[PDB]
């Protein structure tokens, strides 16, 4: 059943499991793998014959998490075109930038549309076409007027995204059919996803975590995916959806797991479904959150490490049946090479820190139009992640942090990851984030911000005293900012430099 293109893999899945459920919209749609497959084929045929989509063309998509997004995403890559999913919340200015930068030739939206995206597309003279799924007797309806021997090549572009800009400049990342097929195989393999598995999407599908792990790897296993009725995560409908659609796992970022834990505290379900595992990725999972999750929902919590340039998955803790999962660790490399290198590019022995570097068929060939970033980031096939970590003697990776977020206090580098984990263990802390700030005496100093739990009162001195009991003195935040809100990216991450800037 494996293939080196995602479209080929999905064709194999549809032929083997045509009547298994593939894609549900809560309360509304329940598509099987054959039905979904054919909706995609017919939509791709319309893209080629009626919307003039040629191999190598880029098609932008901006949708909530909907059935139309799934169908059209897969129709675009099936037509040998590159999908560029974009955040529906962008301004017309941002849409204009991303549409121009990706070389999009077409903009797809729902029937309801998106006014800023359409404004940007009109200005750039990029065609706009809408997509609507009506009922189970009809093809998906495209607003363009009136596929079989399309051949998908592994090196065809399939997915185009941009990097976050947390520590560097936002760069364009082109990913191929081969990149996608490889990551879907890796993700399926390490979690042993099969056609009996089922999940609910609780992350945006325009970022690789929700897209590759939640959606595409499920489909690639003949498994089922459910989208929330309202096109985005809802803490109140989450467990009803997980129960009704027989979910066996889910994946989220730590901030979303925290929201789910808060909901369990204020409104526990009388019963929870028994899951195979719960997955965390994209930002550090504090050990205390791992333990709270395992206690609350009774399933093993497996942390993974991933990035856009690796088409999501790089490493993961394994299934209990294959090995332990370690709090504070992101587990072992899956289906790719990984090495810890010092600044002279020498491989490090276990328990020696250095830059995490990867090599494999899941890794982008290179940033778009950025020969200097490619010369700096790639060497003999190996990509430099910008993350500092080390392997323990079991070969499990422990992340220390992004190179440019480590706090250099008088020659000693502090890990904000480490301190975050400690902050979240304070009885009255709901959220917390440590960050580096300038310091006249030490060059850099560590500060942090915390959000107290509802109805609790916390002081800077409380937090500092608690930190002192649990960290070497040099790591203790010198200033503690109390606040009621920490901004998050759409990918569910708190950006350290933004918080720092806000409180300085
Ligand atoms: N499990 C994790 N723990 C800590 N950091 C992570 C984890 N997964 C991803 N990251 C970080 O997220 C970055 C990728 O972010 P992006 O590709 O911009 O969505 C990585 O290079 C790491 O710095």
From Swiss-Prot:
ATP binds at residues 163-167, 207, 282-284, 303-304, 308, 387, 402, 493. CoA binds at residues 232, 411. Residues 234-303 are annotated as: SBD1. The modification N-acetylmethionine is found at residue 1. Oxalate binds at residues 282, 307, 312, 493. Gene3D superfamilies: 3.30.300.30, N-terminal domain of ligase-like. Keywords: Acetylation, ATP-binding, Cytoplasm, Ligase, Magnesium, Nucleotide-binding, Plant defense. Its cofactor is Mg(2+). GO terms for molecular function: ATP binding; oxalate-CoA ligase activity. It is found in: Cytoplasm. It is an enzyme of class 6 (ligase). Disruption phenotype: Decreased and delayed seed germination, but no other growth and development phenotypes. Increased sensitivity to oxalate-producing fungal pathogens. Oxalyl-CoA synthetase acting exclusively against oxalate. Follows a two-step reaction mechanism, wherein oxalate first undergoes adenylation by ATP, followed by a thioesterification in the presence of CoA to yield oxalyl-CoA. No activity with malonate, succinate, malate, acetate, formate, lactate, glycolate, glyoxylate or glutarate. Required for oxalate degradation, normal seed development and defense against oxalate-producing fungal pathogens. Belongs to the ATP-dependent AMP-binding enzyme family. This is Oxalate--CoA ligase. It comes from Arabidopsis thaliana. The lineage of its organism: Eukaryota, Viridiplantae, Streptophyta, Embryophyta, Tracheophyta.
């Amino acid at each position: 059943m494996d293939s080196d293109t995602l479209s080929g893999l999905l064709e194999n899945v549809a032929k083997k499991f045509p009547d298994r459920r593939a894609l549900s919209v809560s309360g509304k749609f329940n598509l099987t793998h054959a039905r979904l497959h054919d909706l995609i084929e017919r939509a791709a045929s319309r893209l080629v014959s009626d919307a003039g989509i040629k191999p190598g063309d880029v098609v932008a998509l901006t949708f909530p998490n909907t059935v139309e997004f799934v169908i059209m995403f897969l129709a675009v890559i099936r037509a040998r075109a590159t999908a560029a999913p974009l955040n529906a919340a962008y301004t017309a200015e941002e849409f204009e930038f991303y549409l121009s930068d990706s070389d999009s030739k077409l903009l797809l939206t729902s029937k309801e549309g998106n006014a800023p995206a359409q404004e940007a597309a009109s200005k750039l003279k990029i065609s706009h076409v809408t997509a609507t799924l009506l009922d189970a007797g009809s093809d998906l309806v495209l607003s363009v007027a009136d596929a079989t021997e399309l051949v998908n090549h592994p090196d065809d572009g399939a997915l185009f995204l941009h990097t976050s800009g947390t520590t560097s400049r936002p760069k364009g990342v082109p990913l191929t059919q081969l990149n996608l097929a490889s990551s879907v195989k890796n993700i399926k393999a390490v979690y042993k996803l099969t056609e009996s598995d089922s999940t609910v999407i609780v992350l945006p599908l325009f970022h690789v975590h929700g897209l590759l792990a939640g959606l595409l790897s499920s489909l690639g296993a003949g498994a089922a995916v459910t989208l929330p009725a309202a096109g985005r995560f809802s803490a109140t409908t989450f467990w009803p959806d997980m129960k009704k659609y027989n979910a066996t796992w889910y994946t989220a970022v730590p901030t979303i797991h925290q929201i789910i834990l808060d909901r369990h505290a204020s409104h526990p379900e009388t019963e929870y479904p028994k899951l195979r595992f719960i997955r965390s990725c994209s930002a550090s999972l504090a050990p205390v959150i791992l333990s709270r999750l395992e206690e609350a929902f009774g399933a093993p919590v497996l942390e993974a490490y991933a990035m856009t340039e690796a088409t999501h998955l790089m490493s993961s803790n394994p299934l209990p049946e294959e090995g332990p999962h370690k709090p504070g660790s992101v587990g072992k490399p899956v289906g790719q090479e990984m090495a810890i290198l010092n600044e002279k590019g020498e491989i490090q022995e276990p328990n020696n820190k250095g830059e995490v570097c990867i090599r494999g068929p899941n890794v982008t060939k290179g940033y778009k139009n950025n020969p200097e970033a490619n010369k700096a980031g790639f060497e003999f096939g190996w990509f430099h992640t910008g993350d500092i970590g080390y392997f323990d003697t079991d070969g499990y990776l422990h992340l220390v942090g992004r190179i440019k977020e480590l706090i250099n206090r008088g020659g000693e580098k502090i890990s904000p990851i480490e301190v975050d984990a400690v902050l979240l263990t304070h009885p009255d802390v709901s959220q917390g984030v440590a960050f580096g700030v300038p310091d006249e005496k030490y060059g850099e100093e560590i500060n942090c911000a915390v959000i107290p739990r509802e109805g609790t009162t916390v002081t800077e001195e409380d937090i500092k005293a608690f930190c002192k009991k649990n960290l070497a003195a040099f790591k203790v935040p010198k200033r503690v900012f109390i606040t009621d809100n920490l901004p998050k990216t759409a990918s569910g991450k708190i950006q350290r430099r933004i918080v720092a800037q806000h409180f300085l």
